[PDB]
Amino acid sequence: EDVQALVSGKLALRYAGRQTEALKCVAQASKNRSLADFEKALTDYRAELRDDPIISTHLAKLYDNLLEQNLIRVIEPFSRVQIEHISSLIKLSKADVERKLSQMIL
Amino acid sequence: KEQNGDVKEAASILQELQVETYGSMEKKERVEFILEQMRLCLAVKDYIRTQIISKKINTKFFQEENTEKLKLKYYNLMIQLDQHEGSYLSICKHYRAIYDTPCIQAESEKWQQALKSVVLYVILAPFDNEQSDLVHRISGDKKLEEIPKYKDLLKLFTTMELMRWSTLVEDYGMELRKGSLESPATDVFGSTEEGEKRWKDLKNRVVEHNIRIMAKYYTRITMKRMAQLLDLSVDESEAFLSNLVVNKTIFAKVDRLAGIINFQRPKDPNNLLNDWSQKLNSLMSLVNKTTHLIAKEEMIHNLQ
Amino acid sequence: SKMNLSEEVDLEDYVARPDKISGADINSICQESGMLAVRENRYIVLAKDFEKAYKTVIKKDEQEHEFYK
Amino acid sequence: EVKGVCTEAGMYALRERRVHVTQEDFEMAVAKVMQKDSEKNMSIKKLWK
Amino acid sequence: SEQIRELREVIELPLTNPELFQRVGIIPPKGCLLYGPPGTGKTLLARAVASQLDCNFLKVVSSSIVDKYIGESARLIREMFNYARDHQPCIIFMDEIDAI
Amino acid sequence: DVLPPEADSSIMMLTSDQKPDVMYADIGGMDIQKQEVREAVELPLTHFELYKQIGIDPPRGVLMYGPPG
Ligand SMILES: Nc1ncnc2c1ncn2[C@@H]1O[C@H](COP(=O)(O)OP(=O)(O)O)[C@@H](O)[C@H]1O
């Protein structure tokens, strides 16, 4: 939330533009904990922030953290589930869920 | 009261509140002035400021002895403060506090609707030890059997009372239409938008009642039978069992490729085997008390 | 951080100040403005008092008799 | 205070997660252990020339 | 008349309302310094604060705790709180803070 | 039998759930100095094998000094 509070500050308005708007929608996606919204914001702004001057490595750490933070919350009701429903609750494809879950047991 | 109150006159009184406290609070009239501004704060829809200036009141109590219609009737605006978010158990504690004066003021319509308003939503509080003994206090009343909602508090005792939500709907056609005075049921549930939040909450409280009794009396239960025993969909049943188990308030664990869920405790080797010795020790001890007793009755009658 | 400020009044206008402050007196500033809103019956700091709490604790020049500089 | 050189030179390798001790580790440790009184303002010195 | 009340709500409002001390968050308001003459002020307007609840009083002579090694004195702190734990805000009356 | 001793006369031992009242990340930005005190006290107490790996004989005492506050 303080990300928007900085860029609304009077010194940051001098240097406003595209890349500050890139981190705003990333802030809103991390605020809502919406997974594909982060993926959409990464996809919409390529040369801004999927390049890695020194931030896209750190964004991959925050995104790979956000998977199991969303994934641990949706296991507790069951002992046993089929994986197309857990792809439906996460609103994502199932193949990357398989490679992520297989990393979690290993 | 020149322009009969607005945002400005609420600001005009909040800036001049404590100047009397700065002169000398009057056991009564100072309390009567320092209460009056927060209903103006409710007119400006201010709630956090309202309870701060309401907490000054609490030490000046027991002046309703000399007060006929003012002391415990301003607190009907204090439940409007706690009307806001969820605090249902606290304003049923409140209704028992304002229960007394219309029994001093021996009325049979204002006091009867005090019984009506308190018996409606002790139910709507979430289940606790505080709800469990409060209903054990307010039951057994000599006055509660004037109203057919004595049946309802009996119906929410325990062990399901063989219930069904559609039968609860057919017990409650009267809450809008007829009754002796009927007015708090229209006030609580018959309202449009505040009733409808309480409509979904009363549906929420009865399905919460039905989960606990299923955990008492079932090893397993299928998915289709739980949905028809809760009068709603299978997916809305999945949502209700999800946010209760992550609330860790009902122990359950489902299996939704086949739909069979269970309410079993997590099995362990020694505790199951700790049970066989316990049944055994109770068995061997009881036959000793049995044989000791039949030896006596043999001994008495043989002598006659 | 462990204080509900909740305004749009920026604190860094007091970072960039001279009149170097000892670390114990920073603790005095944030607690004084806590008093200088609650005593006036505010459930939140409005940070118009924060100027006055800053100017209060900074005045430790005492007397010095206007003598020997 | 030769020990103080020996401890602080080996301390430089500890913060580097290293066991190797070079001659550069000692020469930085000489200036750390050895100090002075640092008599300031010089007016005391030149009152007493 | 000015000092009956200037001391009143600087004690009353923090003890009656600790919830505002989380609406911004500081626990800290620990009382005023009554200094001046001996007169009747030290003993009599302490009973003016006794007008609502108050009561407690007890007594602080400012001498039985001032023993030199403070390993005993810290126990002599909590010895007086053996009755101050028995209530709500107990009001430790304290005479001759600075007098030996 | 021998009773459990007490050694209980002049007790200043901040222990028995009474010591802390603070976490380690409460201090704002003494990062050269939070790292330095930790090397002499907290580090040889737990990871004593690192000093024996070199033969350091970890240091005994630390003198802090500065303005009051
Ligand atoms: N860098 C700092 N970070 C957080 N709090 C500080 C800092 N410096 C001072 N304080 C606060 O100021 C007070 C100074 O206390 P203390 O350390 O006893 O003073 P001194 O530095 O003279 O020993 C502490 O209670 C502390 O809460």
Curated annotation (Swiss-Prot), chain A:
Subcellular location: Nucleus; Cytoplasm, Cytosol
Expressed in which tissues: Highly expressed in embryonic stem cells (ESCs). Expression decreases as ESCs differentiate.
Disulfide bonds: none
A single MF term (Gene Ontology): structural molecule activity
Sequence ranges assigned to domain PCI in this UniProt record: 1-106
Keyword annotations: Acetylation, Cytoplasm, Isopeptide bond, Nucleus, Phosphoprotein, Proteasome, Ubl conjugation
Crosslinked positions (Glycyl lysine isopeptide (Lys-Gly) (interchain with G-Cter in SUMO2)): K10
GO cellular component annotations of the record: cytosol; extracellular region; ficolin-1-rich granule lumen; membrane; nucleoplasm; nucleus; proteasome accessory complex; proteasome complex
Induction of its expression: By FOXO4; expression in embryonic stem cells (ESCs) is mediated by FOXO4.
BP term (GO), one: ubiquitin-dependent protein catabolic process
Post-translational modification: Phosphorylated by AMPK.
Superkingdom to which the source organism belongs: Eukaryota
Subunit structure comment from the entry: Component of the 19S proteasome regulatory particle complex. The 26S proteasome consists of a 20S core particle (CP) and two 19S regulatory subunits (RP). The regulatory particle is made of a lid composed of 9 subunits including PSMD11, a base containing 6 ATPases and few additional components.
Family note: Belongs to the proteasome subunit S9 family.
Protein's name according to its UniProt entry: 26S proteasome non-ATPase regulatory subunit 11
Organism of this sequence: Homo sapiens (Human)
Gene: PSMD11
From Swiss-Prot, chain B:
Keyword ATP-binding attached: no
Keywords for the protein's UniProt record, in alphabetical order: Acetylation, Intellectual disability, Isopeptide bond, Proteasome, Ubl conjugation
Official protein name in the record: 26S proteasome non-ATPase regulatory subunit 12
Disorder noted: Stankiewicz-Isidor syndrome: A neurodevelopmental disorder characterized by delayed psychomotor development, intellectual disability, behavioral disorders, mild dysmorphism, ophthalmologic anomalies, feeding difficulties, deafness, and variable congenital malformations of the cardiac and/or urogenital systems.
Family the UniProt entry places it in: Belongs to the proteasome subunit p55 family.
PCI domain residues: 90-268
Interval of the full protein contained in this chain: 153 to 456 of 456
GO cellular component entries: cytoplasm; cytosol; extracellular exosome; extracellular region; ficolin-1-rich granule lumen; membrane; nucleoplasm; proteasome accessory complex
Record's function text: Component of the 26S proteasome, a multiprotein complex involved in the ATP-dependent degradation of ubiquitinated proteins. This complex plays a key role in the maintenance of protein homeostasis by removing misfolded or damaged proteins, which could impair cellular functions, and by removing proteins whose functions are no longer required. Therefore, the proteasome participates in numerous cellular processes, including cell cycle progression, apoptosis, or DNA damage repair.
From Swiss-Prot, chain D:
Source organism superkingdom: Eukaryota
Record localization: Cytoplasm; Nucleus
Leader sequence residues: none
Family (UniProt): Belongs to the AAA ATPase family.
Functional description taken from the UniProt entry: Component of the 26S proteasome, a multiprotein complex involved in the ATP-dependent degradation of ubiquitinated proteins. This complex plays a key role in the maintenance of protein homeostasis by removing misfolded or damaged proteins, which could impair cellular functions, and by removing proteins whose functions are no longer required. Therefore, the proteasome participates in numerous cellular processes, including cell cycle progression, apoptosis, or DNA damage repair.
Subunit structure: Component of the 19S proteasome regulatory particle complex. The 26S proteasome consists of a 20S core particle (CP) and two 19S regulatory subunits (RP). The regulatory particle is made of a lid composed of 9 subunits, a base containing 6 ATPases including PSMC5 and few additional components. Component of a complex with USP49 and RUVBL1. Interacts with PRPF19. Interacts with TRIM5. Interacts with NDC80. Interacts with PAAF1. Interacts, in vitro, with the thyroid hormone receptor (in a thyroid hormone T3-dependent manner) and with retinoid X receptor (RXR). Interacts with ERCC6.
Protein name in UniProt: 26S proteasome regulatory subunit 8
From Swiss-Prot, chain F:
Record protein name field: 26S proteasome regulatory subunit 6B
Complex formation: Component of the 19S proteasome regulatory particle complex. The 26S proteasome consists of a 20S core particle (CP) and two 19S regulatory subunits (RP). The regulatory particle is made of a lid composed of 9 subunits, a base containing 6 ATPases including PSMC4 and few additional components. Interacts with NR1I3. Interacts with PAAF1. Interacts with TRIM5. Interacts with ZFAND1.
Protein function: Component of the 26S proteasome, a multiprotein complex involved in the ATP-dependent degradation of ubiquitinated proteins. This complex plays a key role in the maintenance of protein homeostasis by removing misfolded or damaged proteins, which could impair cellular functions, and by removing proteins whose functions are no longer required. Therefore, the proteasome participates in numerous cellular processes, including cell cycle progression, apoptosis, or DNA damage repair.
Localization per record: Cytoplasm; Nucleus
Native organism: Homo sapiens
UniProt record similarity statement: Belongs to the AAA ATPase family.
